[PDB]
Design a protein around this ligand. Structure first.
Ligand SMILES: CC(=O)Nc1cccc(-c2cnc3[nH]c4cnc(C#N)cc4c3c2)c1
Length: 264
């Protein structure tokens, strides 16, 4: 069928460092995809990782075409946009909605970690929603292999987003990858349930961070969060990444398993 590889770029979905992500609609089928435009004048690795990914809570990769200097990455389109725009400032969102998004977040992260991949920059800006509000992890531009041939590699590159970074990345030369993603997922949860981020960064100089370690949960964001999800956050946002809760244990947490939401 003629024309079936022609795509009209119809709308900018986002504009980072690389360039842009455009909504693309097929000339013939009208299938909608997201196309990432990355002017190579680092993405080879983003593509490399994207080729490994196949899961319902991970933005699917379809393929890429290079034309001269620009690379075109063809990616699953998520019509619900970014989790960020479901978080009402200072309020957050209804707890059953946060729990469902957190469930889906975990399934995605479990998957990635299973294939030896760390995202390194989980935040509501990078967590996308499809037409049925299913969450999908996006943007693998900072992602990296932390396990290959069943051997773990400790990380050392400082990367991610300060309010979402785990404290070890600021304090230690090297660190395990998985606890960093678990930590960012907890800050995402906090934001979902409080509509505010708890600190500019998790350093002992950061007053809001010291207060959290001092267990001042009569202060915001923590006062807004119910005891049950707050109890989970006390297990996730633990300074020592060796003592921090693992994802298999997050799946056993009382809040995680609390019935709250009716089906679609
Ligand atoms: C109406 C509408 O579609 N709004 C809206 C808003 C924000 C992000 C998006 C968005 C929708 N679908 C996507 N699919 C992607 C795959 N990879 C990247 C990267 N890196 C970003 C997106 C993306 C972004 C869509």
């Amino acid at each position: 069928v003629p024309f079936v590889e022609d795509w009209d770029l119809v709308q900018t979905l986002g504009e980072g460092a690389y360039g842009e992500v455009q909504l693309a609609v097929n000339r013939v089928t009208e299938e909608a995809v997201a196309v990432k435009i990355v002017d190579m004048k680092n993405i080879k690795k983003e593509i490399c990782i994207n080729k490994m990914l196949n899961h319902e809570n991970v933005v699917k990769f379809y393929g890429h075409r290079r034309e001269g200097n620009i690379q075109y990455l063809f990616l699953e389109y998520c019509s619900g946009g970014e989790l960020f725009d479901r978080i009402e400032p200072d309020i957050g969102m209804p707890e059953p909605d946060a729990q469902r998004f957190f469930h889906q977040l975990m399934a995605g992260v479990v998957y990635l970690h299973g294939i030896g991949i760390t995202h390194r920059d989980i935040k509501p800006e990078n967590l996308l929603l499809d037409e049925r509000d299913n969450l999908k992890i996006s943007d693998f531009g900072l992602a990296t292999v932390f396990r290959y041939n069943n051997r773990e590699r400790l990380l050392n590159k400082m990367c991610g987003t300060l309010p979402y970074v785990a404290p070890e990345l600021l304090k230690r030369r090297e660190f395990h990858a998985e606890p960093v993603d678990v930590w960012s997922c907890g800050i995402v949860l906090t934001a979902m349930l409080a509509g505010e981020l708890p600190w500019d960064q998790p350093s002992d100089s950061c007053q809001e961070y010291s207060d959290w370690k001092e267990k001042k949960t009569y202060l915001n964001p923590w006062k807004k969060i119910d005891s049950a999800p707050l109890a989970l956050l006390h297990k996730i946002l633990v300074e020592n990444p060796s003592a921090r809760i693992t994802i298999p244990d997050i799946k056993k947490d009382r809040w995680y398993n609390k019935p709250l939401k009716k089906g679609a």
